[PDB]
Design a protein around this ligand. Structure first.
Ligand code: APR
Ligand code: APR
Lengths: 157, 157
């Protein structure tokens, strides 16, 4: 593996014929409350739009997935809760090693009453999010879709 | 946006402080038959392992998502069917613009009876795939997890 670029959140490498993008692991948090799922939106320069995502972030040096999940939920929404590890997935194993760990957040509590408004909190019924996407009103990130699908599969009971 | 690298399947660009990876759009096909979902595995150099995925590929010049989905299913399994567009998602909007279009494949038929064995066809019950992942026996790609979650949510009926 030869390196063409070493950066902030990623490294571009070449492994023979394969173009590989090394990337820090990430976490995502699925939170449901009274029928509404906690979605978030922020302008994403990579796509030039703000897709419907769920609280997510990169794992910091020294912390594990669980700790990153707790911190992410807190920084984005000022909330904490009972977190349970659900599953993990490689975002696109064909070119990047980015791995995402997904957690479920229950019994949410306020720990902080973001002042910069960098992240838009969008509480919405998953059925409504799916409906809007099917209509072409909003785009989904992998985490947003996973949250929607996970809800319909196991959280209606 | 300034370019640091222009390659085969991706381009590495810099947009101020943001590191952006431009990538060709992709498709994924969810196929269920008698309780089993059509999963596939292939060694992925980016991760050094073969995660559990569903038939997927990059859209070729001149074709749309539907055509790419049909071709991908055919090349990987020698099968064709009634395809229905389900939804789309950005694999990781924080750094890449890769967008994946997901389709459902029904009433599968054999059109070709891959000789190189580059892709391993793994027919498996989604409940079993989820179980194995929870046990740490196999890793999921975003497409594999989406297929599993989609099944549990809408295909058990
Ligand atoms: N990292 C890479 N760099 C250069 N060429 C590559 C790479 N990965 C695959 N290829 C080449 O591109 C061609 C195939 O692209 P697609 O087969 O159509 O396939 P694929 O890699 O299967 O899947 C697309 C989607 O699923 C995965 O999540 C992947 O990350 C992508 O988003 C192949 O001949 C192969 O030679
Ligand atoms: N493309 C980028 N290049 C450089 N720095 C970036 C980029 N995107 C975000 N950052 C910086 O990295 C820091 C934050 O990383 P995380 O906030 O933790 O966040 P995030 O981008 O939200 O989400 C992680 C996961 O969700 C998305 O699918 C994303 O693609 C990633 O997989 C921020 O201060 C921001 O300045």
């Amino acid at each position: 593996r030869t390196y063409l670029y070493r950066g902030r959140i990623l490294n571009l490498a070449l492994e023979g014929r394969y173009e590989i993008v090394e990337h820090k692991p990430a976490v995502a948090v699925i939170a449901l409350r009274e029928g509404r799922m906690l979605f978030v939106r922020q302008m994403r320069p990579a796509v030039g739009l703000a897709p419907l995502e769920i609280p997510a972030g990169l794992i910091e040096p020294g912390e594990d997935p669980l700790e990153a999940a707790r911190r992410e939920l807190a920084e984005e929404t000022g909330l904490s809760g009972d977190l349970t590890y659900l599953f993990s997935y490689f975002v696109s194993p064909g070119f990047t090693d980015e791995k995402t760990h997904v957690f479920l957040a229950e019994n949410l509590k306020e720990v902080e009453a973001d002042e910069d408004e960098a992240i838009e909190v969008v509480w919405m019924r998953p059925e409504e999010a799916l409906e809007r996407h099917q209509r072409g009103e909003v785009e989904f990130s992998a985490t947003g879709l996973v949250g929607v699908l996970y809800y319909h599969a196991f959280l209606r009971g």
